[PDB]
């Protein structure tokens, strides 16, 4: 539900 708001770098 909640969206990824940090890069795939972390």
């Amino acid at each position, epitope marked *: *539900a*909640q*969206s*990824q*708001r940090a*890069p*795939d*770098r972390v």
Partner: antibody
Amino acid sequence: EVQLVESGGGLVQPGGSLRLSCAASGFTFSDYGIAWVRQAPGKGLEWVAFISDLAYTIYYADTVTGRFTISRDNSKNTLYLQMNSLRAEDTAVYYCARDNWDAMDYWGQGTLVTVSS
Amino acid sequence: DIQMTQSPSSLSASVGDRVTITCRSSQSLVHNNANTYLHWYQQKPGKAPKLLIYKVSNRFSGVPSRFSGSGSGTDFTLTISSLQPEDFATYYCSQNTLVPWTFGQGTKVEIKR
């Protein structure tokens, strides 16, 4: 200097396919997620797909899932949207927008997809 | 799944008037990280939308100071403090906290002349 340029739009028969391309420029492309957002003529904005940073997470709108595939080539600085089984309901200006990691801050000028016989 | 409702859908105001556009959520837009991903867009005729405000109240680079944002949880607000002729457009709120990402319907601002 940040720019996103959509191409590959056009006329398609219903049931037909297109591959949209978004050529990124003027930032580190590999650092950001990229979204597609579409706007049917005279209508509001509809989000359709997102590919993360390194492609780990991918989101589709229900309206689009199963038919549209979002992909990216970081070494080419290009994003793609493969659109299969096009209905008339898909006629729209399709925008590629870079995501800050908090907001879609830079959008391209758009490419129009007209599904028609 | 978040329904974004704007008020009004359109309006006419004179130059120099204060204009308020309302956005309503069906669900809190506070993320797990404590941030609230509500953003506001301006779309002029045959041009892509431009980011005006991000995270409720942050004015995007190059956005004039007469555009501001406000709100928490469910109810948010865009203010144009002194409306200018170039401010003619459709304004959209959007959320990025949950998937799907969703926009409001738009609020068309017309300048009364």
